[PDB]
Enzyme design. Structure first.
Site, PDB file in Angstrom:
ATOM      1  N   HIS A 142     -16.696 -28.338 -24.304  1.00  0.00           N
ATOM      2  CA  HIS A 142     -18.014 -28.000 -24.806  1.00  0.00           C
ATOM      3  C   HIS A 142     -17.919 -26.793 -25.740  1.00  0.00           C
ATOM      4  O   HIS A 142     -18.498 -26.793 -26.871  1.00  0.00           O
ATOM      5  CB  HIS A 142     -18.957 -27.742 -23.614  1.00  0.00           C
ATOM      6  CG  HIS A 142     -20.323 -27.242 -23.975  1.00  0.00           C
ATOM      7  ND1 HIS A 142     -21.514 -27.979 -23.748  1.00  0.00           N
ATOM      8  CD2 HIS A 142     -20.727 -26.018 -24.447  1.00  0.00           C
ATOM      9  CE1 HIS A 142     -22.537 -27.243 -24.175  1.00  0.00           C
ATOM     10  NE2 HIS A 142     -22.112 -26.057 -24.561  1.00  0.00           N
ATOM     11  N   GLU A 143     -17.235 -25.751 -25.326  1.00  0.00           N
ATOM     12  CA  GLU A 143     -17.143 -24.568 -26.169  1.00  0.00           C
ATOM     13  C   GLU A 143     -16.308 -24.827 -27.426  1.00  0.00           C
ATOM     14  O   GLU A 143     -16.775 -24.397 -28.545  1.00  0.00           O
ATOM     15  CB  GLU A 143     -16.478 -23.414 -25.423  1.00  0.00           C
ATOM     16  CG  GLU A 143     -17.003 -23.056 -24.051  1.00  0.00           C
ATOM     17  CD  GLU A 143     -18.445 -22.942 -23.940  1.00  0.00           C
ATOM     18  OE1 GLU A 143     -19.253 -22.822 -24.854  1.00  0.00           O
ATOM     19  OE2 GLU A 143     -18.902 -22.895 -22.683  1.00  0.00           O
ATOM     20  N   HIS A 146     -18.391 -26.475 -30.116  1.00  0.00           N
ATOM     21  CA  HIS A 146     -19.249 -25.611 -30.903  1.00  0.00           C
ATOM     22  C   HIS A 146     -18.497 -25.143 -32.157  1.00  0.00           C
ATOM     23  O   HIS A 146     -19.091 -25.027 -33.203  1.00  0.00           O
ATOM     24  CB  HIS A 146     -19.763 -24.396 -30.137  1.00  0.00           C
ATOM     25  CG  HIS A 146     -20.882 -24.704 -29.169  1.00  0.00           C
ATOM     26  ND1 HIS A 146     -22.056 -25.295 -29.564  1.00  0.00           N
ATOM     27  CD2 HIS A 146     -20.994 -24.435 -27.875  1.00  0.00           C
ATOM     28  CE1 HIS A 146     -22.888 -25.315 -28.539  1.00  0.00           C
ATOM     29  NE2 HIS A 146     -22.283 -24.806 -27.507  1.00  0.00           N
ATOM     30  N   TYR A 157     -28.727 -22.790 -34.246  1.00  0.00           N
ATOM     31  CA  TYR A 157     -28.890 -22.751 -32.796  1.00  0.00           C
ATOM     32  C   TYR A 157     -30.282 -22.359 -32.327  1.00  0.00           C
ATOM     33  O   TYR A 157     -30.476 -21.343 -31.660  1.00  0.00           O
ATOM     34  CB  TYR A 157     -27.788 -21.889 -32.219  1.00  0.00           C
ATOM     35  CG  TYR A 157     -27.450 -22.187 -30.781  1.00  0.00           C
ATOM     36  CD1 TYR A 157     -26.788 -23.310 -30.420  1.00  0.00           C
ATOM     37  CD2 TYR A 157     -27.796 -21.304 -29.770  1.00  0.00           C
ATOM     38  CE1 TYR A 157     -26.429 -23.511 -29.107  1.00  0.00           C
ATOM     39  CE2 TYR A 157     -27.388 -21.489 -28.419  1.00  0.00           C
ATOM     40  CZ  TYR A 157     -26.769 -22.640 -28.092  1.00  0.00           C
ATOM     41  OH  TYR A 157     -26.416 -22.875 -26.828  1.00  0.00           O
ATOM     42  N   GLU A 166     -26.214 -28.376 -28.961  1.00  0.00           N
ATOM     43  CA  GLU A 166     -25.864 -28.377 -27.551  1.00  0.00           C
ATOM     44  C   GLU A 166     -25.439 -29.776 -27.107  1.00  0.00           C
ATOM     45  O   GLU A 166     -24.444 -29.933 -26.365  1.00  0.00           O
ATOM     46  CB  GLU A 166     -27.060 -27.879 -26.737  1.00  0.00           C
ATOM     47  CG  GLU A 166     -27.007 -26.409 -26.437  1.00  0.00           C
ATOM     48  CD  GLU A 166     -25.765 -26.022 -25.702  1.00  0.00           C
ATOM     49  OE1 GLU A 166     -24.997 -25.124 -26.209  1.00  0.00           O
ATOM     50  OE2 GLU A 166     -25.440 -26.592 -24.639  1.00  0.00           O
ATOM     51  N   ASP A 226     -35.095 -19.846 -24.436  1.00  0.00           N
ATOM     52  CA  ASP A 226     -33.852 -20.658 -24.612  1.00  0.00           C
ATOM     53  C   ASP A 226     -33.697 -21.054 -26.071  1.00  0.00           C
ATOM     54  O   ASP A 226     -33.249 -22.176 -26.332  1.00  0.00           O
ATOM     55  CB  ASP A 226     -33.827 -21.811 -23.614  1.00  0.00           C
ATOM     56  CG  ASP A 226     -32.555 -22.670 -23.654  1.00  0.00           C
ATOM     57  OD1 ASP A 226     -31.476 -22.019 -23.788  1.00  0.00           O
ATOM     58  OD2 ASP A 226     -32.691 -23.914 -23.569  1.00  0.00           O
ATOM     59  N   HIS A 231     -30.942 -25.890 -24.508  1.00  0.00           N
ATOM     60  CA  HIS A 231     -30.313 -26.503 -23.365  1.00  0.00           C
ATOM     61  C   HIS A 231     -31.206 -27.462 -22.600  1.00  0.00           C
ATOM     62  O   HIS A 231     -30.756 -27.948 -21.535  1.00  0.00           O
ATOM     63  CB  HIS A 231     -29.884 -25.383 -22.380  1.00  0.00           C
ATOM     64  CG  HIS A 231     -28.839 -24.481 -22.927  1.00  0.00           C
ATOM     65  ND1 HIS A 231     -29.142 -23.282 -23.566  1.00  0.00           N
ATOM     66  CD2 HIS A 231     -27.513 -24.686 -23.055  1.00  0.00           C
ATOM     67  CE1 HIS A 231     -27.982 -22.771 -24.024  1.00  0.00           C
ATOM     68  NE2 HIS A 231     -26.995 -23.592 -23.676  1.00  0.00           N
TER      69      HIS A 231
HETATM   70  N1  LIG Z   1     -21.260 -21.190 -27.219  1.00  0.00           N
HETATM   71  C1  LIG Z   1     -22.327 -20.607 -27.266  1.00  0.00           C
HETATM   72  O1  LIG Z   1     -22.609 -19.630 -28.054  1.00  0.00           O
HETATM   73  C2  LIG Z   1     -23.429 -21.215 -26.393  1.00  0.00           C
HETATM   74  C3  LIG Z   1     -22.935 -21.668 -25.009  1.00  0.00           C
HETATM   75  N2  LIG Z   1     -22.055 -22.804 -25.144  1.00  0.00           N
HETATM   76  C4  LIG Z   1     -24.084 -22.113 -24.133  1.00  0.00           C
HETATM   77  O2  LIG Z   1     -24.280 -23.358 -24.058  1.00  0.00           O
HETATM   78  O3  LIG Z   1     -24.788 -21.159 -23.631  1.00  0.00           O
HETATM   79 ZN   LIG Z   2     -23.160 -24.643 -25.575  1.00  0.00          ZN
END
Ligand SMILES: NC(=O)C[C@H](N)C(=O)O
Ligand SMILES: [Zn+2]
Ligand SMILES: [Ca+2]
Ligand SMILES: [Ca+2]
Ligand SMILES: [Ca+2]
Ligand SMILES: [Ca+2]
Ligand SMILES: [Ca+2]
Ligand SMILES: [S]
Ligand SMILES: [S]
Length: 316
Positions: A142-143, A146, A157, A166, A226, A231
């Site tokens: 996931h990271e 990004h 974002y 996301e 958020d 999210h």
């Molecule tokens: N990577 C980020 O800056 C956001 C992080 N992945 C989250 O979902 O909070």
């Molecule tokens: Zn994220």
């Protein structure tokens, strides 16, 4: 560092032994020279200054409890790199083999992980909400995803583009989890979330509303918390992706599943060829339909299924 490539061994956050690519020069460092321009993992030492120190070990054995998050950040970055190269022909997150940097032990009790525009950063959790976050392959992927998005669509974002951002991270995080074939599922973060509660996670792609998130556009969050629900509203997109892959009937609309490989191809094309920094959900549908048209043809079942899935979640 300059040194020679070697292979250490250790245990990760869930107690599983695995080998790791390291570099020897005085110490053994968590520097994998086998992938791209390297994968490098750092110790933040409970502070928030970044990146910290490149992780050094006297004996190339990483079995200490303190070692475990570094083992997994390092290893799962490798797996993620391999997914993107082998499946998508993408070399690292920038498509030019950029070095992958991760820091562990960020802060004290920090119940999250993130890409900061230059690296990956993992908290250890507070021991109740989370254990160290790099223990989750989907989390790590996931990271890193990004980073992929930053270098491609650049979805802002906030609001719908943020929720897309996301969802893309959850989609690919999950697809990496399936690629590695490690107890795969359509949940996010289950391996590191709430030790001592079984079966839960942060989010569910197959049933977003399990954790309070919307599964139809008509239930989208419209507030300001958020970053405008990035999210929360990701559930709408996560559900559509799950339906494209797996099929089902949702709110009476039946979707013919086309499987994970095709899901990945469709969404990777959309991300890399059609989405832009301000894409909203409607534009994501267009992008996905167009991508599936490119890949399979306008009258294809793949196109039909994408349309069905977006219809099912209320996105025209
Ligand atoms: N990577 C980020 O800056 C956001 C992080 N992945 C989250 O979902 O909070
Ligand atoms: Zn994220
Ligand atoms: Ca050691
Ligand atoms: Ca799993
Ligand atoms: Ca998962
Ligand atoms: Ca749990
Ligand atoms: Ca929730
Ligand atoms: S599937
Ligand atoms: S469409």
């Amino acid at each position: 560092i300059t040194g020679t490539s070697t292979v250490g061994v250790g245990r990760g956050v869930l107690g599983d032994q695995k080998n790791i690519n390291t570099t020897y020069s005085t110490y053994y460092y968590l520097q994998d020279n086998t992938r791209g321009d390297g994968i490098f993992t750092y110790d933040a030492k409970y502070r928030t200054t970044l990146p910290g120190s490149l992780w050094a070990d006297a004996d190339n054995q990483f079995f200490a409890s303190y070692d475990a998050p570094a083992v997994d950040a390092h290893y799962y970055a490798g797996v993620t790199y391999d997914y993107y190269k082998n499946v998508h022909n993408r070399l690292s997150y920038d498509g030019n083999n950029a070095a992958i940097r991760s820091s562990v032990h960020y802060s004290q009790g920090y119940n999250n992980a993130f890409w900061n525009g230059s690296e990956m950063v993992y908290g250890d959790g507070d021991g109740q909400t989370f254990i160290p976050l790099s223990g989750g392959i989907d989390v790590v992927a996931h990271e890193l995803t990004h980073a992929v998005t930053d270098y491609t669509a650049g979805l802002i974002y906030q609001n719908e583009s943020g929720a897309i951002n996301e969802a893309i991270s959850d989609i690919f995080g999950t697809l990496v989890e399936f690629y590695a074939n490690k107890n795969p599922d359509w949940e996010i973060g289950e391996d590191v979330y709430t030790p001592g509660i079984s079966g839960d996670s942060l989010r569910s792609m197959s049933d977003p509303a399990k954790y309070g998130d919307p599964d139809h556009y008509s239930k989208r969050y419209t507030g300001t918390q958020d970053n405008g629900g990035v999210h929360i509203n990701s559930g709408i997109i996560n559900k559509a992706a799950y339906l494209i892959s797996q099929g089902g009937t949702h709110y009476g609309v039946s979707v013919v599943g086309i499987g994970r490989d095709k899901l990945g191809k469709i969404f990777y094309r959309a991300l890399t060829q059609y989405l832009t920094p301000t894409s909203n959900f409607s534009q994501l549908r267009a992008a996905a339909v167009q991508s599936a048209t490119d890949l399979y043809g306008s009258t294809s079942q793949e196109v039909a299924s994408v349309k069905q899935a977006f219809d099912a979640v209320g996105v025209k």
